[PDB]
């Protein structure tokens, strides 16, 4: 119980994929002729990330070889992966024939159940306070190549003897050959890890198909007779890594400067790029004969499924101080602990070991440092308030062995407290009003507050705005949400909506709907606010959108909405996150 | 708290690449007809180096098998790499056709999105006080080769029997062959680590393309009919190691002599050599038939992006002493510590554990050595000033067990101090004016001061000049800066500029601009000094430079510029670094 | 602080390569017609060896399984390599054409930038006192070979049926083949480590090219049309190990007998064998047609660059005793230590822990052995001088626990010393004139004296001569130095020079010039002695040397030249080394 501190918690990422989200044209050549059908059954995304916050050094260690910095770790390894990604259980096909007269054109088209074209994962920093330190894999694949050069020559002499009715013959023949060939050999994987770093704050890992990446390459036939009609996609070539179940492996480790303060958000985008398979047959008619050839379609439609979860980290968190905090508890009272406010006034409140402000770090020099703000220390010169920390002899404390008398190094006096009010003070000996007994114990301030889900799509610029004093939210509402903000002058987004105000007090849940807007793009279209008392109110319209998805955010009891994060470009809002506390 | 000391700090290297810097001719054969367009979108350079300073032996260890020397380490490994280098997210292409009629010439030309021809990293020593000790990789690739010699002979006898209307025939035929072929096999990588050591002070690592290094080799076709028009660069061959994201891995460890003093700088240069891809088509017209052949262009333009960061190391730094310094603190006062000036006078100042002059090293013999200058020691014969260190018996100190009385080995007397002035003295026993209590603690003098950025390009000879007493910076400026200096006689650079004077007092920030000068080469063109008052000032002109890049330098509050580093050859200034404090 | 002792120090080997030394004829067939040009730009040699001196057993350990011997280690490993060897940064070429009429001869010749034909490293022992113990690699490569014998037979029967206007035919044909081939497979490296051991005192390591070792093998073409004119050397085949940067890996470990005394020098030769590449084209004219063939030149010129560095080891050094020396210090005085002269008289001088004569080794039996000469011991029978060591009971000492009274085992008396003169003596109790307090401490006698550089070339027999009483150096002056020596009768070398005399007193620096002598070979040509007065002095002439190289030697202030090492055979002087102090 003297090693590094750690804060660990999970992020569950769940997003069911509706069958309607998997609706695609039953044919690529004949879109409007034959209609549409689902391509994935009960698709689901379920991963479980692990988050670790840790300072790279213990508090008070000077001269260590590992640079002093604050480390945020987001990882997936053997110890925690999650259910995976699912799209189907087995691949079937429906065959389509030419309705019109076909002689020199395509006349048969095949639809193959959906496969995962590529898995995409995105990590984003909310501001510039964080930087990317190291990643796993450390690099993209640095392929190894093998070459061969084969050369040589061949000599041959031929002796032939023929006897027939015509007469004896004789042939002596000579041959001289030369050969030369160059070989090339390299390894490719079924899925290739493509690392992508847009800038110092964001790095994205893309599992992309490399082998069998084209509908062209999935065929096991090239030409066949006209009367042979069979499924030409050798489905054994599609490995179960593509449609059955997949799980990634990645590590990202952010760092923050030594004295960075404030806040920073992290966004984790898990996404699978669904792409059905289309294969068509080509009929060729020339004078001499008739045959049939196949082709592969490459520019078939692709639809992307996105689910996002975020979590907030404060650099002022106690864990980043790198020590194991303890509290000073006055033993005269049944339950009284020393607590420090923002300005440094010392009072004795009710003990609550999960409250950061009541924790102190015990260093090598014997000083007590306030856990929530490492620049304030306990000083014996004026014990009614904390003081700036320095090398003063009056700020060192030692425990007398075998008892609980807390002593001051400088003057030899002890630490004492009022038996009734909790005021600290220095005393050489006890009396009927001052007790010297003080007890210390380790505290649990390493809980991580859970993070609220995100609603919508996480694209474009992100803004952060605090809720106003009136606790009312301004929404510009039309066919889709135009803008959001805490005041009528702080709207970011559209202008065609209807101005209104919705009370955020007592909100029991929020129902957000997002999807493909009728005019274009993906937008947030509908928000339904339900209160714990039972009344409801709805803004926006739910009837001008297709491929909609429903996300729900249930506030725990007795909470107040405090911050609004707005995902919006110049036109419309694509996402919004409601923080608590 | 007893092992080797270490000083560690990070270097962040960020440099956004403007789209303008990525502008290239849309075609190589037809420059002026078709124009230009960007070739890389949102390119960025972001690496994070780790710097370690350490002495290879602890202080006071004699005759250890590792030679005594001072070690400076600059490295990138799995523990810290950074975001990497980015140029594009996927490679597109635009196709171009012949505007005029072509019969036997090139008539189709292709432009491929930019790829990284080679990555380059450069390390430079500022003077000859440092040498390169070891590097990783230790050596270039020492390829292994495999040879085969295949030889043999073949015999064949043929019996032929024919029956026809002409008559029965009979043929007995003999063959005898000889074969010989020689094989060659070797391994090549997609990128080949080329180590380059210009001299003992500078070594550079060049990641260079080896396989698929020519626009010739990227083609998957050689000949095709005139009517077939498709993109002929098999883009699957370009591995994601070239354009998506790349991260190096190398170590450089410098060494400095045992008693070297003064200062020495290091320069770290990250550079990615952007090179677009050009492919052309050849139409051949001969009498018998008509066909089309491809070619690869090798002399395509290349443009180099450079970002440089530096840091300064003083061989007199406390960490290079190889011990863990402590300080002697007088206990009578609340806050008084022993401090030594330049000449060795001893006075009691305010304690500041980060001040090097107040730190002392505790060796094996029991001597106290001043950490700031290891040639001075504490001596009991004349305790008001430090003396040259030797084997004198009066320079050894031992702590009395269970108390804090500092004793002298020679006479048995103790260490004493004035209760009011802090004057040291020898006393056999205490009194009302002299107290014997002294307290010791470990000190944090291992912080590393942050390093100022470099403005411009780091090429040519480098000069270092102290800021003058008047705090005036002389700039001989024209279209670009001709020279810089601290006095009218110490201008290094050109002479065609008009002499001027800019005051360096109260500089709040510096705006530097660099790029390709109109006449030739890459120069520094304009500097805009911002004062805390709010007034600005301009030297040079920004109207005669293309492909310019902008860098900014923000000084901390209340600081004085003290050193000027000038990058300039005989003609013009290529870069300048403003050291602080 | 009880394990093996060690002495470690670095040897820096720096040698700039002038562009003039890289001058070669621009063509091989046409020497005088075309002229000459540089072939290497900014070439440099920079390695850093590590030297370790150690005795294989701790002092006093009897019968250990490792044989008792003195070990000298010279090595290069991953922990210390140096910058490497550099010749060029990229390989360019210049093309030459025939100025005269060429029908059946060469008509085009190519010059390729220089590459390192072979790297060479040489270790020499100065006398027979040292032998080679083990080396890394332990042996040359013991190649592994793979053989295959392929044999078999093939049968074939052919049935042919023809219908034509002539009439139906029928053929039944039989074939029977036999095959046999033998394979051979072996591995070769781009550079092959060739170990070379001339005698027991000298072993040399030669990195020699094995694959692509001939200008013949560098060609990727054999025949081509007369109108095709392109560079025919496939430059990709030249691995960056040859011209970019190279670093060796070797270990040499000398041993010396148990009681060897005197001195011995070691010579370390680093040399890179520069060799340009020449390729020519062959035009062949025969009646039927005309074609062009290539050839490889093998007898191309080679020029060798040599840099030598040496260091001196004395077997009488304290470290070779294999213990950790300590010293006896009298506590009555402020600063007095026991010191032993050449003959063994004991006097109390000023302590200097780096002086070998004041160190003593503490063995298992409790004897004190003088570190400077392990045959002398401290004895209590006659305590004013050291005695030959044996098993006498009066030569054992034990410390009384808890105090510093040094006791004698035999009589029970203590070690005593005069309070004023430092004379040792035996006493049972103290008085006003004799004090018993003695203090012991570890000493730093493991510093290694710096080694002086070598001027010139290290070839031929080596001689060593002490500087005479007059401190005058005899030089035979001509076009080059004929001989050197400390007296007119002690000249080693030639006799054709003019006799002269030069003073060696107050020499602040020496300027040595060496290179290719006009008459033949490589000689030392000129020496310019610089005094403290600033005036110079010239012996020899600089007008008879081409491709000369300049080496410099700067002495420390207030130094005396004491030994002359002369590198010269019977004709002329090739090198000279001036030992310092």
């Amino acid at each position: 119980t003297n090693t590094l501190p750690h804060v660990a918690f999970y992020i569950s990422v769940n997003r069911a994929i509706s069958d309607e989200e998997c609706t695609f044209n039953n044919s690529w050549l004949w879109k409007n002729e034959k209609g549409s059908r689902p391509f994935c059954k009960d698709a689901n995304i379920s991963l479980i990330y692990r988050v670790n916050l840790e300072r790279s050094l213990q508090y008070g260690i000077v001269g260590s070889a590992t640079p002093d910095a604050k480390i945020v770790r987001i990882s997936l390894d053997d110890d925690s992966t999650g259910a995976g990604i699912h799209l189907n259980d087995q691949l079937g096909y429906r065959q389509f024939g030419a309705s019109y007269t076909t002689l020199d054109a395509y006349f048969r088209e095949w639809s193959t159940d959906a496969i995962a074209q590529d898995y995409r994962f995105v990590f984003n920093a909310s501001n510039n306070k964080a930087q990317i330190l190291k990643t796993f894999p450390v690099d993209n694949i640095n392929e190894k190549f093998e070459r061969k050069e084969v050369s040589g020559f061949e000599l041959g002499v031929t002796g032939g003897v023929e006897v027939s009715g015509d007469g004896p013959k004789a042939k002596l023949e000579a041959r001289a050959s030369y050969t030369q060939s160059r070989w090339l050999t390299y390894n490719t994987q079924d899925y290739r890890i493509e690392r992508n770093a847009k800038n110092a704050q964001a790095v994205s890992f893309t599992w992309n198909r490399q082998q069998y990446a084209t509908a062209e390459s999935l065929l096991n036939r090239s030409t066949d007779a006209l009367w042979v009609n069979t499924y030409p996609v050798d489905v054994n070539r599609i490995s179960p890594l593509s449609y059955a179940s997949f799980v990634p492996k990645m590590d990202v480790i952010y760092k923050a400067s030594a004295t960075e303060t404030g806040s920073t958000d992290f966004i984790i985008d898990s996404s699978v790029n669904i792409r059905p398979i289309y294969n068509g047959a080509y009929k060729h008619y020339y004078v001499v004969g008739a045959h049939q050839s196949y082709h592969g379609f490459e520019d078939t439609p692709r639809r992307r499924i996105t689910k996002s979860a975020s979590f907030t980290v404060d650099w002022d968190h106690p864990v980043f101080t790198g020590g194991r905090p303890v509290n000073l508890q006055l033993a005269s009272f049944n339950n009284r602990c020393i607590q420090v406010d923002a300005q440094g006034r010392l009072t004795a409140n009710m003990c609550d070991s999960q409250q950061s402000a009541q924790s102190f770090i015990y260093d090598q020099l014997g000083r007590y440092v306030s856990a929530s703000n490492t620049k304030l220390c306990l000083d014996g010169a004026a014990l009614d308030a904390l003081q700036p920390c320095n090398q003063n002899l009056t700020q060192r404390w030692e425990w007398r062995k075998g008892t609980d008398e807390l002593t001051n190094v400088y003057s030899g006096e002890s630490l004492g407290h009022d038996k009734q009010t909790g005021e600290l003070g220095l005393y050489a000996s006890s009396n009927d009003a001052v007790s010297l007994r003080t007890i210390t114990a380790y505290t649990d301030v390493f809980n991580a507050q859970e993070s609220s889900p995100i609603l919508g799509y996480t694209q474009g610029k992100m803004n952060q705005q605090r809720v106003g004093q009136d606790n009312r939210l301004y929404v510009r509402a039309g066919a889709a949400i135009d803008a959001l903000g805490s005041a009528s002058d702080l709207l970011v987004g559209g202008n065609g909506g209807s101005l209104s105000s919705v009370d955020l007090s007592g909100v029991k849940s929020i129902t957000a709907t997002s999807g493909d807007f009728q005019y274009g793009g993906q937008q947030l279209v509908a928000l339904t606010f339900t209160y714990q008392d039972g009344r409801q109110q709805t803004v926006g319209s739910k009837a001008y959108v297709t491929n909609a998805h429903e996300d729900r955010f249930d506030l725990p009891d007795a909470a107040k909405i405090t911050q609004l994060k707005i995902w919006a470009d110049d036109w419309l809002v694509k996402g919004v996150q409601f923080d608590l506390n």
Side-chain angles (χ1 to χ4, degrees), chain A residues 1 3-32 35-40 42-102 104-143 145-165 167-168 170 173-181 183-286 288-344 346-400 402-448 450-465 467-468 470-497 499-507 509-517 520-531 533-543 545-559 561-569 571-581:
Chain A
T1 52
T3 69
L4 224 47
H6 274 116
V7 166
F9 62 101
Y10 287 149
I11 300 179
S12 299
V13 178
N14 295 335
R15 158 68 126 96
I17 299 184
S18 61
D19 312 3
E20 181 179 356
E21 267 166 333
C22 274
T23 304
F24 291 80
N25 300 326
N26 295 336
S27 145
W28 157 249
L29 303 163
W30 302 331
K31 307 171 181 174
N32 300 282
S36 54
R37 90 178 193 268
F39 268 157
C40 352
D42 290 325
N44 171 277
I45 311 179
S46 301
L47 315 180
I48 293 191
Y49 298 101
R50 191 178 83 248
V51 162
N52 277 342
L53 312 177
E54 61 176 28
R55 175 169 191 165
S56 40
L57 301 171
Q58 319 177 37
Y59 179 82
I61 278 194
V62 169
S64 173
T66 312
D68 193 304
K70 304 182 179 178
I71 289 287
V72 173
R73 185 180 316 180
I74 294 184
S75 62
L76 291 181
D77 67 351
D78 304 334
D79 305 337
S80 46
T81 81
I85 291 186
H86 184 109
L87 291 182
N88 279 96
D89 294 51
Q90 71 279 0
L91 308 191
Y93 61 79
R94 290 188 174 180
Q95 190 173 186
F96 286 144
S99 50
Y100 69 103
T101 298
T102 54
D104 176 66
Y106 300 123
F107 76 101
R108 283 202 183 98
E109 197 171 8
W110 278 285
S111 77
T112 291
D113 295 338
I115 71 176
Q117 170 71 14
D118 57 85
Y119 301 87
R120 166 145 305 193
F121 298 79
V122 175
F123 301 82
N124 277 16
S126 50
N127 48 10
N128 75 326
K129 296 188 184 303
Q131 294 176 161
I132 301 164
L133 185 57
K134 86 196 183 192
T135 47
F136 193 99
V138 291
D139 185 348
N140 300 278
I141 45 167
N142 193 164
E143 288 285 358
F145 279 48
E146 166 168 329
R147 290 238 287 275
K148 285 189 170 296
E149 302 202 24
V150 168
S151 65
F153 58 97
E154 173 185 4
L155 296 87
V157 359
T158 302
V161 176
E162 172 209 6
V163 36
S164 74
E173 194 162 344
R175 299 186 306 271
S177 298
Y178 183 104
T179 321
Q180 166 160 357
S181 50
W183 282 13
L184 181 49
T185 298
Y186 56 91
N187 310 359
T188 62
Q189 312 182 16
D190 203 356
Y191 280 78
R192 177 176 63 185
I193 290 187
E194 300 184 12
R195 182 170 178 273
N196 195 337
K198 300 153 194 171
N199 17 80
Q201 279 75 349
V203 51
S204 66
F205 292 85
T206 293
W207 265 250
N208 181 12
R209 287 181 64 93
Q210 180 175 12
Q211 188 85 357
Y212 294 168
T214 81
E216 163 92 14
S217 57
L218 273 177
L219 297 172
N220 71 334
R221 292 175 165 267
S222 63
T223 67
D224 200 327
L226 279 74
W227 63 88
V228 175
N229 169 271
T230 182
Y231 186 64
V233 177
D234 200 357
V235 88
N236 273 333
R237 288 188 181 177
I238 300 182
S239 44
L241 188 48
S242 279
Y243 65 81
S245 151
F246 169 65
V247 161
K249 292 293 187 180
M250 101 265 278
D251 273 61
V252 173
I253 289 193
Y254 295 151
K255 99 173 172 59
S257 45
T259 71
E260 197 80 298
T261 187
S263 306
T264 289
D265 321 331
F266 300 140
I267 298 165
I268 299 185
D269 279 337
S270 308
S271 60
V272 36
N273 188 3
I274 285 184
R275 166 249 181 80
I277 308 178
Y278 287 84
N279 291 260
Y282 187 95
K283 181 175 180 177
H284 231 1
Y285 163 69
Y286 47 74
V288 188
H291 79 285
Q292 187 183 16
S293 58
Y294 300 92
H295 283 143
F297 296 95
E298 189 63 36
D299 28 323
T300 55
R302 301 185 178 94
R303 177 166 281 97
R304 180 165 295 252
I305 313 301
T306 291
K307 177 59 174 182
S308 304
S310 75
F311 69 114
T312 305
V313 184
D314 305 323
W315 304 133
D316 285 333
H317 208 269
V319 61
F320 282 81
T321 61
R324 285 189 170 277
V326 309
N327 52 2
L328 311 182
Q329 186 167 323
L330 307 177
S332 87
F333 305 94
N334 185 21
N335 183 302
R336 279 298 197 274
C337 286
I338 293 185
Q339 183 169 338
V340 47
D341 53 355
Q343 311 133 358
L346 281 181
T347 47
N349 319 25
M350 172 171 295
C351 301
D352 207 8
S353 45
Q354 292 198 21
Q355 182 64 219
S356 62
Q358 302 180 21
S359 301
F360 297 82
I361 298 181
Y362 206 88
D363 58 355
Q364 282 71 17
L365 302 188
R367 312 181 307 170
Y368 271 91
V369 177
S370 174
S372 60
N373 180 17
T374 38
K375 292 178 179 56
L376 313 175
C377 290
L378 181 67
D379 195 328
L383 265 167
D384 64 332
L386 298 195
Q387 312 303 308
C389 312
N390 68 337
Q391 302 290 148
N392 281 18
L393 270 191
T394 48
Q395 299 185 23
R396 301 187 184 178
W397 309 79
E398 305 168 2
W399 300 81
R400 175 163 296 106
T403 44
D404 288 333
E405 294 186 9
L406 199 64
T407 72
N408 188 315
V409 182
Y410 158 66
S411 59
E413 307 170 358
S414 312
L415 181 61
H417 68 303
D418 187 306
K419 240 192 175 188
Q420 297 163 349
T421 73
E423 169 185 357
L424 310 186
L426 288 183
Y427 299 92
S429 63
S430 51
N431 55 10
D432 293 356
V434 166
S435 183
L436 285 181
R437 188 180 177 175
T438 313
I439 298 183
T440 174
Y442 286 99
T443 63
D444 181 6
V445 304
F446 295 89
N447 297 14
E450 202 189 14
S451 172
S452 295
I454 229 174
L455 312 176
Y457 287 98
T458 63
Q459 298 177 355
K461 178 191 177 181
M462 185 270 297
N463 289 74
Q464 188 168 4
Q465 297 178 2
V467 173
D470 48 314
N471 204 0
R472 307 195 83 86
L473 154 69
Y474 281 74
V475 173
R476 304 288 312 199
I481 273 66
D482 305 58
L484 303 177
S486 55
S488 74
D489 68 325
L490 305 181
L491 301 167
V492 42
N495 308 317
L499 196 151
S500 179
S501 175
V502 183
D503 183 15
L504 301 180
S505 70
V507 172
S509 56
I510 282 186
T511 295
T513 295
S514 63
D516 300 322
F517 192 76
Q522 306 179 349
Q523 320 291 352
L524 178 74
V525 290
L527 303 173
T528 298
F529 295 76
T530 296
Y531 297 75
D533 40 74
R535 76 185 191 97
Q536 288 196 4
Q537 183 174 11
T538 304
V539 312
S541 180
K542 319 178 181 179
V545 71
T546 66
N547 319 337
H549 167 58
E550 162 203 344
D551 287 329
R552 186 177 179 88
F553 162 57
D554 296 339
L555 290 79
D557 204 76
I561 295 185
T562 63
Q563 284 194 355
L564 305 190
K565 300 167 188 166
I566 299 171
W567 272 254
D569 51 354
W571 189 10
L572 292 178
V573 182
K574 316 186 207 65
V576 45
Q577 182 183 354
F578 292 87
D579 282 6
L580 297 185
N581 322 341

